[PDB]
Design a protein around this ligand. Structure first.
Ligand SMILES: Nc1ncc2c(n1)CCCC2=O
Length: 172
């Protein structure tokens, strides 16, 4: 089943959200011929739509803010699919404001999930994986779907640079 069956509905959703949110977004899709099982195609749309929404709302900054920070004025959102062996890898990348890891740590300490003492030596992945804790901010819901497809998800993010969410699906 080509993934384009899912990806083809996204330019409309992205442009509707950009408009309602007053962002300017350059949306690029790559790898849309990538084939995978019908069950995956039927289920992956919801979690991707959530990731695209997060990027437009929380990641990409309004154009005035990007200019004020010396970034290219219009933010860019790239959705990509490819094969890596017998697995399909889907990426959602934006060049927005990124995730503030300090805020994550503060929030985790408030919620009683980590000691201040242990926050100093947390890895980058340890910190960002708090976002998957249920009720932390829902990245939990994204992970729940990916998990039910026997996939995995990771986040990479750096403040002011942007965010890349990666989803790895088995052949099934
Ligand atoms: N793409 C993207 N960029 C920023 C953020 C998110 N996703 C979700 C967490 C909140 C946040 O700040």
């Amino acid at each position: 089943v080509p993934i384009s069956f899912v990806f083809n509905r996204f330019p409309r959703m992205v442009r509707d959200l950009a408009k309602k949110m007053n962002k300017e977004v350059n949306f690029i899709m790559r790898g849309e011929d990538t084939e995978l099982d019908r069950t995956f195609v039927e289920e992956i749309g919801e979690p991707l739509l959530h990731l695209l929404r997060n990027a437009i709302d929380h990641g990409i900054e309004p154009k005035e803010e990007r200019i004020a920070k010396g970034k290219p004025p219009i933010g860019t959102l790239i959705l990509s699919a490819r094969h890596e062996g017998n697995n399909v890898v889907i990426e959602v990348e934006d060049d927005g404001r990124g995730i503030d890891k300090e805020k994550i740590i503060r929030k985790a300490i408030e919620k009683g999930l980590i000691d201040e003492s242990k926050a100093a030596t947390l890895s980058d992945q340890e910190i960002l994986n708090f976002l998957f804790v249920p009720g932390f901010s829902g990245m939990d819901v994204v992970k729940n779907v990916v998990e039910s497809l026997n996939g995995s998800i990771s986040i990479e993010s750096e403040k002011d640079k942007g965010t890349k969410v990666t989803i790895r699906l088995p052949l099934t």
